RNA sequence: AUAUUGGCGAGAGACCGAUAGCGAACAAGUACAGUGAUGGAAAGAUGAAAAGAACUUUGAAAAGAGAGUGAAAAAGUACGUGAAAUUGUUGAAAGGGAAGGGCAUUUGAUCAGA
RNA sequence: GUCGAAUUUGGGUAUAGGGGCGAAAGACUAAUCGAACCAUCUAGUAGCUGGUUCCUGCCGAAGUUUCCCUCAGGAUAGCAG
RNA sequence: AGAACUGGCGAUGCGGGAUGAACCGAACGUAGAGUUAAGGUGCCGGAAUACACGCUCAUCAGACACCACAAAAGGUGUUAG
RNA sequence: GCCCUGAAAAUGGAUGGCGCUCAAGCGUGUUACCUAUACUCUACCGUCAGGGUUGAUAUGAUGCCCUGACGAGUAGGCAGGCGUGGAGGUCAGUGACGAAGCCUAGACCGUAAGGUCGGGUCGAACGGCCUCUAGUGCAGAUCUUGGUGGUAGUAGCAAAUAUUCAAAUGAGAACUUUGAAGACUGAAGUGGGGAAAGGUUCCACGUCAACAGCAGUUGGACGUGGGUUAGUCGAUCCUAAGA
RNA sequence: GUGAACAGCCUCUAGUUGAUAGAAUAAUGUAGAUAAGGGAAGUCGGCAAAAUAGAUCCGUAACUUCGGGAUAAGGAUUGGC
RNA sequence: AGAACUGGUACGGACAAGGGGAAUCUGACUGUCUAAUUAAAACAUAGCAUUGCGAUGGUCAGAAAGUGAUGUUGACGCAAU
RNA sequence: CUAUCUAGCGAAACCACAGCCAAGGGAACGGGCUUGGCAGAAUCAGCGGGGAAAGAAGACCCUGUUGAGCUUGACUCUAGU
RNA sequence: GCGUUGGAUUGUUCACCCACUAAUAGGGAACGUGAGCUGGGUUUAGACCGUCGUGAGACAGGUUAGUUUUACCCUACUGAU
RNA sequence: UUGGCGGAAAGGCCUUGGGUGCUUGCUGGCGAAUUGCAAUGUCAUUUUGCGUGGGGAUAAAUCAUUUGUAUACGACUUAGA
C-alpha cells in the first residue's frame, strides 16, 4: 500500500505495483507515460502493438542521442523506441490490476490507467573492467512501477 | 600568417546551402522576358529525363579545325508527351512582390493529375474538384467571373499544366503539376489562351523548335552523406595521416573562434536543384512517327530507342527532345525545359545542325548492333531462332 | 615510603555516543590484499510480544490485490525515526541564445491582525 | 633479427639494499631503482601553497625607517586598537 | 624603470566619463521632501528638435579633459584679418 | 579659423547606438530644465558626548528622561549579543491526552545571528532563566567518509572464417538437449595426457535470487550428496650445486 | 595428399561450432584490394606498397684476408599426355 | 635425362616464395643491453699491450674470528687495466 | 568490420554557473560586463573553430639559507693500510 | 573582383638555382592552423666526436637513435527531422 | 434596397428608392432626490465554451505493407480497396 499521490475514488480503482524489476528505470519511465491517464483496454492494444513493432513508445524525456522513427508522428515526436522489457513488466502489472478491478467488482469496460508512476529501485552492481588496469561501475538501473486503474464516472 | 601557397577556393560559393532540394520537380525561379507581340505560347515544357545517346552530325563552324568534318557529340532524349492544360494563375504585381491572385482550373481533371492531390490515393474518396465542377453547372458565370478578374489585374498570366506519366513507361502514375508562364501579348488574350486550351493537350513542337538553345532544370541525382574530398574536392591528405585522410586538415584558424560557413565539410551531396542554361536541341522527333532514330542520310526504319530500350526507363513511345550534351537529374526524372531568357548570337548558338546518325545500340551492354534487323544479318542463324 | 599505557579483581567520570569512542559496541585483528615483512575494513536499533501476515484471488514465479496480526504495517525483517543531494507521479506557474538576484508595483494564490 | 651453441628453457641452488647483479643501459633487483619493499623514529621540518566555521556595533591601517647569510622572512620605529 | 610634494586607489560604495581601481563630482545608518554637484536635455534617456551671433559640406565630415592618437608640407575651397 | 590633400592592415563595427547638415557639428553667450548614498529640514536606529532624576504608590539609577553631534571601510582591535554538547542551581518547568527529531511559496518577533507559534509525520525524552565548562557554529582546504547526479539509455558490447532447419523440454529458447545440415581446429590441433599452480572446479540429483558485461530451462553458478582403493606409479632412500 | 619440408592449403581419428544479436549498407575509419598515362615529380627520407621469388639449365664483375663476394649481375625452361 | 603430340603460349597456374647494382661513414665478424619511447656507430668479443704477485704473496671479502673468494689454483696461473 | 537504426546490456573523463556574435574597456585575447547585432520549442548524424577543452600542484627558468645522484687536494672526518 | 605555379639542395623560416607562366606581390588571422596530420629540426633519457675541464661534466659545435593521448558534452559549422 | 467603383493589404467608398425611429430648428407638460459632501462608480472590444432555434457540408493524413528517381535514422519519391 501507501501508493503515489492519487486523485481517484479508492472504491473504484484497484491497484498493482511491483517493485525491484530489474528493468531500465529510463525505458519504463517512458513506457509508464506512453499508457498514463489510456483506457485500460487501448493502452494493453497498445503495449501489444508496440511488441509487434507497428506503434512506438515516445521517449520525450530520456531521449538523448537515441534515434528517429517515422512511428512518433502520431505523438508529435521524431525520437521513439520499442522497450520490450519494459513493455512486458507494464503489462503484466496491468494484467495484475485488472485481476484486482474483477476481483473488486469494477466494470472493467470503463476501466482506465488514472495513475502510473516509475521511480528508480536501488542498483544492482556488478563491475567492468577498463584499460590500464582500471575498474568502473557496471550497474543496473530497476523500477519500481506501481499502477492504479479506475472506473470512468461523470 | 598567411597561406605560402595560392590555391583557388574549392567549390562554389553561389550554390549553397549543398542541401536536398524541397522538391524532386525543381522550380522554374525565372520565365523568358514578356514580349507582348508574339503569339500567346507557353515558355517551358515538362518531360522526363529518359537517357542519353550518341549522334553523328557534320560540324558547321567556319574557322575551325573540324569546319564541314563530322563530330560525334552526346545527346540526351528526354521524353516530352504533350502536357495537358488544366488551370490558369493569375498574379498582380504588389510592392511585397508578385502574388497569385485567383486561378481557374479546368472543369474535368483527369486522374493522373487528381492523384498528385493525395498522398493515399487507392483508399480516397476521389472528392477532389467535386465541388468545384459545379461551377460549370448551367454556363459557368462564376468561372467566367473568375477569368474576367484576371483579365482586370494579373499582369503575369500562367497556366497549370500537368504531364501524362500514363504515356511515359514509369510507374508513378502520378502526374507532375506545374505553372508556366504565358508570354505573348495582351493579358486579357493570355486568359483566351489558356480557357480554349482548358483539358486540352499542347505538344512539345508547339514550344520548342529544332536548334533552339534551352535551360533544362531539374534536381541532381542525389548521393547521400558524401565527405569533404568528393563533395568539395578537396586535396586528399597524405596516406600517413592519423584519425583518416579524406578530410580538411584545417577547418578554420583560431580567429574567428568559430567554423566558417566557406569552410568544407562533409554533407549531402546531389539533389540540388539546378538550372543548366544552352543546351541546344538537336531533335524535336515525334512519338508516332516511326524512323525517330533516322536521319536523312541514315534512312533505317528505326525508333530512337536503344535496343532493349532505354536502361532504367524504357522506351520512347511519345514527343521527345534531343539536347546537345548532358542535363542535370537522372533517368526517369522530372526535367523542365525553359527558353534561354536572352538571345545568343555567338555562331554555337545560330547553328543548323543536320544529324546523320543516331546511336541506337544497346545501352545494357558494348552494343553491336543498331537494330535486331542488322543482328540477325551479322549472326546468321541461331539454335533458338533467327 | 617510590614506579606501573602488561596481567587479575574492583569503583568511578562536567569523557565519546556507531563517520564519535580502541582498528574492532556486531562470528575484529575478523573478511580481504601482499611472495613476504606487514596492511586491515565495513558492519548496532521491527515490535511489549513474531503476534514474522492463516485464508482467498491474479500471476509460471518473484510478487501484487485483498484478508489479517498489531497501539501503529506512515513498524513487513529491503524492518525505530527517516533529512539532503538526486528522482517519479500529480497539481500550479513561467519560458525568442542561460537561470538565479535588488528596488517598486500590477495580476493570481494564500494569510495574520481588528 | 636470429634459429645448432656466447642457443633457448624447467626445476634446484647462491648472491639482499649503499647491498647484490650488470657482454655496462644507471640497466635489473616482484608494474617500485641515479639506492627496493615493510614498520617505526614521525603528527620529521617548511621564511612556501591551500583552508581556517555565528551576527551586529564602534574604531581603523601598512607596504615606510634602521639592522639582519636579508631581498617570498624577521627584529625595530612608525601607522592602529 | 627610479625619486620629491600632495591627493587618491589598495581598503570605496554612490552620480558622471557608454564601458574602466585610480579621472570629475561626491564619500555611504534607515526613510520622506526639497536643492544641487560633475555630467547632461533629438530618440534610446530623466531633462529646451531652447534662444542668439557666426563658421563648416567632407566620394575617409565632425562631435568634449584623463582617453583611447595623427605631423611636416600644401589648397582663387570658404571666412575673417 | 573651419573644411580638404597629406591619411596604408589585416573577423564585421563603432562620436556608446540610431541618426544628425542655418545640426542633434565647431567657437561663443544667455536662460530654463534633469538628477547622486552630496547639501537643507523632519522622522526613526544606533554610537559618542554633556546633563536631569533615589523625597515618596517609585520592584528595572548599567533604570527613566533631556540636549547636541555623529554613522564609508580591507588587514586588524575591541564591545554587545545569537546558536551547540555537557555541568551546578532554579522554574515543585514541558511530555505517551504525545518529548526530541524531521517536512511545512503557513503566522509572529528581532537590523541580524536567531527565536516563537500553527499543521503534518513521529515515538520517549526535553526545555526557559542565573551561572560553569568546551572536542562549540563551515562553502570552499585537488578537505575526510558516505551517498547521489548531468554526462547518458550515451561511449560502447566489432580480433580468433559460421552458422542454419526441425523436434523435445520449458511460463518463456538466437544461446539448453537430440537429430539433420554447413564449417573449422587439420596431429608444432581447438585432439589425447601430465609438471607447477588451483582445490573439488570432477560426477549425479535438484535448481535459476545473484554471477556467466545479451539471454538462459544451461554452467567451472546456487543447494544437497557421491567420488581419489598400490609391495610393483611416485614420495619415502642416494647424492648434486648447496644448506 | 601436395610439397625439400613439423611451411602454407585441403582432409581422416578426436574435438569444437564458443565469442550479444537482428535490420540496413551514409560519411569518416580499421583491415584487405585494384587502377588508364606518367613513374618518386610526393616526402626530411621510396615511409607504405609494388616489383623479385621455387626448381633445372646457362652465365656471373670489381674487390679479396684467396676462404668469399655469389642466389652477384643477367638470361632461358617449367602444364598435360 | 631425352623425344613426339597437345592447349586462347598456358604451366613454381592456388599456396609458397631474394629486388638488384655503383658507392661513402661507421662497427671487423657471430653475440649483448635501456622489460614499458633509444638495438646503435653503444657493450662484449678474439687479437694486442700494460700492471701486481713465488703463497709469511697479489687482488678482493668479513664486526671479529683457530673466518673467508681466487684456490680441487701456481706465472702457458690468478688478479687489475 | 564498424559507425548508423533496433532488442537487451550499459560505463567513463569532465562539470563554479553555463553556453550566439562584433567592438569597447578590462589582469593589456569575454559566454557573462557596456554599446550594438540579434534572438522561437524539441532534436539526429557528422565535425574538429572555440570552450586560452581534458589528462598532471610545469619536467624548462628563477627563488628556497629544500634535497638527492655523482666529482674533486672544497670543509670535516673515516674503514682499511 | 580574380589569380599568384612545377621542381634540384636544405628539417628549415630564409635562401639559391632550373623551368613554365599573365604573374610567379607582400602580409595577417594566438609569429592562423599538432584532440587536423607529420615529426625532418629543436628540446629529456642511449651513443660518437672536436674543443674545454683534474674530474663528475659543459658547448645557439657537429652526428646518429628516440611512445605525438581523449571528444560521446556545449557552441560554431555541415547536412537532417 | 438600386446601380457603380475600389486588387497594393481591395474587405471599403459612392449612389437610387421607399419604410421606420429620433430630431435641441422653435414653444410647452410631467419625472429625477436618499449614490446621503467624492470614490472608474462599471456603458468598450477580444477570444473561448455552452444552450436554444435556423442554414450548410458529408474528408483526409499518419502508422503498417510497397517503390528506389531517395536515404545513416528521420525525411523524400512511388504503389496498393
Ligand atoms: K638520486
Ligand atoms: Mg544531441
Ligand atoms: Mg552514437
Ligand atoms: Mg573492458
Ligand atoms: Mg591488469
Ligand atoms: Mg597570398
Ligand atoms: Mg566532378
Ligand atoms: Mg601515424
Ligand atoms: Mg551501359
Ligand atoms: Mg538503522
Ligand atoms: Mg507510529
Ligand atoms: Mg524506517
Ligand atoms: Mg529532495
Ligand atoms: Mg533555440
Ligand atoms: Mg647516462
Ligand atoms: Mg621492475
Ligand atoms: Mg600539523
Ligand atoms: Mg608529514
Ligand atoms: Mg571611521
Ligand atoms: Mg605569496
Ligand atoms: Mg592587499
Ligand atoms: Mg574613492
Ligand atoms: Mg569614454
Ligand atoms: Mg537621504
Ligand atoms: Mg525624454
Ligand atoms: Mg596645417
Ligand atoms: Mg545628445
Ligand atoms: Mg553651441
Ligand atoms: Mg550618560
Ligand atoms: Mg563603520
Ligand atoms: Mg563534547
Ligand atoms: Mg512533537
Ligand atoms: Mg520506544
Ligand atoms: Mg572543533
Ligand atoms: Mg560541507
Ligand atoms: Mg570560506
Ligand atoms: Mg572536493
Ligand atoms: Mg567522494
Ligand atoms: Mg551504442
Ligand atoms: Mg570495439
Ligand atoms: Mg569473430
Ligand atoms: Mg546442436
Ligand atoms: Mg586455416
Ligand atoms: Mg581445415
Ligand atoms: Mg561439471
Ligand atoms: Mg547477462
Ligand atoms: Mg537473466
Ligand atoms: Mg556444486
Ligand atoms: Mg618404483
Ligand atoms: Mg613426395
Ligand atoms: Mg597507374
Ligand atoms: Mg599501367
Ligand atoms: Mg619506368
Ligand atoms: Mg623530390
Ligand atoms: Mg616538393
Ligand atoms: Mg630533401
Ligand atoms: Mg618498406
Ligand atoms: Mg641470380
Ligand atoms: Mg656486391
Ligand atoms: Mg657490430
Ligand atoms: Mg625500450
Ligand atoms: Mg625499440
Ligand atoms: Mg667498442
Ligand atoms: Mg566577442
Ligand atoms: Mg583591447
Ligand atoms: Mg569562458
Ligand atoms: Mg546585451
Ligand atoms: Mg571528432
Ligand atoms: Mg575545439
Ligand atoms: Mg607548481
Ligand atoms: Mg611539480
Ligand atoms: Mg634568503
Ligand atoms: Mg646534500
Ligand atoms: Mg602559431
Ligand atoms: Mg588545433
Ligand atoms: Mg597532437
Ligand atoms: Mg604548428
Ligand atoms: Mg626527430
Ligand atoms: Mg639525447
Ligand atoms: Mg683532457
Same mark, same amino acid.
Request: aromatic share 8%; glycine share 8%.
Given at each position: 500500500?501507501?501508493?503515489?499521490?492519487?486523485?481517484?475514488?479508492?472504491?473504484?480503482?484497484?491497484?498493482?505495483?511491483?517493485?525491484?524489476?530489474?528493468?531500465?528505470?529510463?525505458?519504463?519511465?517512458?513506457?509508464?507515460?506512453?499508457?498514463?491517464?489510456?483506457?485500460?483496454?487501448?493502452?494493453?492494444?497498445?503495449?501489444?502493438?508496440?511488441?509487434?513493432?507497428?506503434?512506438?513508445?515516445?521517449?520525450?524525456?530520456?531521449?538523448?542521442?537515441?534515434?528517429?522513427?517515422?512511428?512518433?508522428?502520431?505523438?508529435?515526436?521524431?525520437?521513439?523506441?520499442?522497450?520490450?522489457?519494459?513493455?512486458?513488466?507494464?503489462?503484466?502489472?496491468?494484467?495484475?490490476?485488472?485481476?484486482?478491478?474483477?476481483?473488486?467488482?469494477?466494470?472493467?469496460?470503463?476501466?482506465?490507467?488514472?495513475?502510473?508512476?516509475?521511480?528508480?529501485?536501488?542498483?544492482?552492481?556488478?563491475?567492468?573492467?577498463?584499460?590500464?588496469?582500471?575498474?568502473?561501475?557496471?550497474?543496473?538501473?530497476?523500477?519500481?512501477?506501481?499502477?492504479?486503474?479506475?472506473?470512468?464516472?461523470? | 600568417?598567411?597561406?605560402?601557397?595560392?590555391?583557388?577556393?574549392?567549390?562554389?560559393?553561389?550554390?549553397?546551402?549543398?542541401?536536398?532540394?524541397?522538391?524532386?520537380?525543381?522550380?522554374?525561379?525565372?520565365?523568358?522576358?514578356?514580349?507582348?507581340?508574339?503569339?500567346?505560347?507557353?515558355?517551358?515544357?515538362?518531360?522526363?529525363?529518359?537517357?542519353?545517346?550518341?549522334?553523328?552530325?557534320?560540324?558547321?563552324?567556319?574557322? =575551325?579545325? &573540324?569546319?564541314?568534318? !563530322?563530330?560525334?557529340? *552526346?545527346?540526351? $532524349?528526354?521524353?516530352?508527351?504533350?502536357?495537358?492544360? %488544366?488551370?490558369?494563375?493569375?498574379?498582380?504585381?504588389?510592392?511585397?512582390?508578385?502574388?497569385?491572385?485567383?486561378?481557374?482550373?479546368?472543369?474535368?481533371?483527369?486522374?493522373?493529375?487528381?492523384?498528385?492531390?493525395?498522398?493515399?490515393?487507392?483508399?480516397?474518396?476521389?472528392?477532389?474538384?467535386?465541388?468545384?465542377?459545379?461551377?460549370?453547372?448551367?454556363?459557368?458565370?462564376?468561372?467566367?467571373?473568375?477569368?474576367?478578374?484576371?483579365?482586370?489585374?494579373?499582369?503575369?498570366?500562367?497556366?497549370?499544366?500537368?504531364?501524362?506519366?500514363?504515356?511515359?513507361?514509369?510507374?508513378?502514375?502520378?502526374?507532375?503539376?506545374?505553372?508556366?508562364?504565358?508570354?505573348?501579348?495582351?493579358?486579357?488574350?493570355?486568359?483566351?489562351?489558356?480557357?480554349?486550351?482548358?483539358?486540352?493537350?499542347?505538344?512539345?513542337? =508547339?514550344? &520548342?523548335?529544332?536548334? !533552339?538553345?534551352?535551360? *533544362?532544370?531539374? $534536381?541532381?541525382?542525389?548521393?547521400?552523406?558524401?565527405? %569533404?574530398?568528393?563533395?568539395?574536392?578537396?586535396?586528399?591528405?597524405?596516406?600517413?595521416?592519423?584519425?583518416?585522410?579524406?578530410?580538411?586538415?584545417?577547418?578554420?584558424?583560431?580567429?574567428?573562434?568559430?567554423?566558417?560557413?566557406?569552410?568544407?565539410?562533409?554533407?549531402?551531396?546531389?539533389?540540388?536543384?539546378?538550372?543548366?542554361?544552352?543546351?541546344?536541341?538537336?531533335?524535336?522527333?515525334?512519338?508516332?512517327?516511326?524512323?525517330?532514330?533516322?536521319?536523312?542520310?541514315?534512312?533505317?526504319?528505326?525508333?530512337?530507342?536503344?535496343?532493349?530500350?532505354?536502361?532504367?526507363?524504357?522506351?520512347?513511345?511519345?514527343?521527345?527532345?534531343?539536347?546537345?550534351?548532358?542535363?542535370?537529374?537522372?533517368?526517369?526524372?522530372?526535367?523542365?525545359?525553359?527558353?534561354?531568357?536572352?538571345?545568343?548570337?555567338?555562331?554555337?548558338?545560330?547553328?543548323?545542325?543536320?544529324?546523320?546518325?543516331?546511336?541506337?545500340?544497346?545501352?545494357?551492354?558494348?552494343?553491336?548492333?543498331?537494330?535486331?534487323?542488322?543482328?540477325?544479318?551479322?549472326?546468321?542463324?541461331?539454335?533458338?531462332?533467327?
Amino acid at each position: 500500500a501507501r501508493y503515489g499521490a492519487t486523485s481517484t475514488n479508492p472504491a473504484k480503482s484497484a491497484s498493482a505495483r511491483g517493485s525491484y524489476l530489474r528493468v531500465s528505470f529510463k525505458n519504463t519511465r517512458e513506457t509508464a507515460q506512453a499508457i498514463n491517464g489510456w483506457e485500460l483496454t487501448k493502452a494493453q492494444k497498445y503495449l501489444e502493438q508496440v511488441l509487434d513493432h507497428q506503434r512506438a513508445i515516445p521517449f520525450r524525456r530520456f531521449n538523448s542521442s537515441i534515434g528517429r522513427t517515422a512511428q512518433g508522428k502520431e505523438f508529435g515526436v521524431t525520437k521513439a523506441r520499442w522497450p520490450a522489457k519494459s513493455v512486458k513488466f507494464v503489462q503484466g502489472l496491468l494484467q495484475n490490476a485488472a485481476a484486482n478491478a474483477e476481483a473488486k467488482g469494477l466494470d472493467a469496460t470503463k476501466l482506465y490507467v488514472s495513475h502510473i508512476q516509475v521511480n528508480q529501485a536501488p542498483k544492482q552492481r556488478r563491475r567492468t573492467y577498463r584499460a590500464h588496469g582500471r575498474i568502473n561501475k557496471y550497474e543496473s538501473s530497476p523500477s519500481h512501477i506501481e499502477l492504479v486503474v479506475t472506473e470512468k464516472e461523470e | 600568417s598567411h597561406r605560402k601557397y595560392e590555391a583557388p577556393r574549392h567549390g562554389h560559393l553561389g550554390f549553397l546551402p549543398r542541401k536536398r532540394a524541397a522538391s524532386i520537380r525543381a522550380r522554374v525561379k525565372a520565365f523568358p522576358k514578356d514580349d507582348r507581340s508574339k503569339p500567346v505560347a507557353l515558355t517551358s515544357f515538362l518531360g522526363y529525363k529518359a537517357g542519353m545517346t550518341t549522334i553523328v552530325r557534320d560540324l558547321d563552324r567556319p574557322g =575551325s579545325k &573540324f569546319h564541314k568534318r !563530322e563530330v560525334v557529340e *552526346a545527346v540526351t $532524349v528526354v521524353d516530352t508527351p504533350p502536357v495537358v492544360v %488544366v488551370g490558369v494563375v493569375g498574379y498582380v504585381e504588389t510592392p511585397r512582390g508578385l502574388r497569385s491572385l485567383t486561378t481557374v482550373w479546368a472543369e474535368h481533371l483527369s486522374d493522373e493529375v487528381k492523384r498528385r492531390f493525395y498522398k493515399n490515393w487507392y483508399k480516397s474518396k476521389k472528392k477532389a474538384f467535386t465541388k468545384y465542377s459545379a461551377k460549370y453547372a448551367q454556363d459557368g458565370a462564376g468561372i467566367e467571373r473568375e477569368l474576367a478578374r484576371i483579365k482586370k489585374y494579373a499582369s503575369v498570366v500562367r497556366v497549370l499544366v500537368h504531364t501524362q506519366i500514363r504515356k511515359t513507361p514509369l510507374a508513378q502514375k502520378k502526374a507532375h503539376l506545374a505553372e508556366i508562364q504565358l508570354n505573348g501579348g495582351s493579358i486579357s488574350e493570355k486568359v483566351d489562351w489558356a480557357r480554349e486550351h482548358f483539358e486540352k493537350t499542347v505538344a512539345v513542337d =508547339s514550344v &520548342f523548335e529544332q536548334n !533552339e538553345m534551352i535551360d *533544362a532544370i531539374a $534536381v541532381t541525382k542525389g548521393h547521400g552523406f558524401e565527405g %569533404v574530398t568528393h563533395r568539395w574536392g578537396t586535396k586528399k591528405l597524405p596516406r600517413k595521416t592519423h584519425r583518416g585522410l579524406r578530410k580538411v586538415a584545417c577547418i578554420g584558424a583560431w580567429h574567428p573562434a568559430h567554423v566558417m560557413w566557406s569552410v568544407a565539410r562533409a554533407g549531402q551531396r546531389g539533389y540540388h536543384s539546378r538550372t543548366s542554361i544552352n543546351h541546344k536541341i538537336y531533335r524535336v522527333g515525334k512519338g508516332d512517327d516511326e524512323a525517330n532514330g533516322a536521319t536523312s542520310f541514315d534512312r533505317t526504319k528505326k525508333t530512337i530507342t536503344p535496343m532493349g530500350g532505354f536502361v532504367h526507363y524504357g522506351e520512347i513511345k511519345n514527343d521527345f527532345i534531343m539536347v546537345k550534351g548532358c542535363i542535370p537529374g537522372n533517368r526517369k526524372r522530372i526535367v523542365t525545359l525553359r527558353k534561354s531568357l536572352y538571345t545568343n548570337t555567338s555562331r554555337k548558338a545560330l547553328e543548323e545542325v543536320s544529324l546523320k546518325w543516331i546511336d541506337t545500340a544497346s545501352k545494357f551492354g558494348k552494343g553491336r548492333f543498331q537494330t535486331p534487323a542488322e543482328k540477325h544479318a551479322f549472326m546468321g542463324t541461331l539454335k533458338k531462332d533467327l
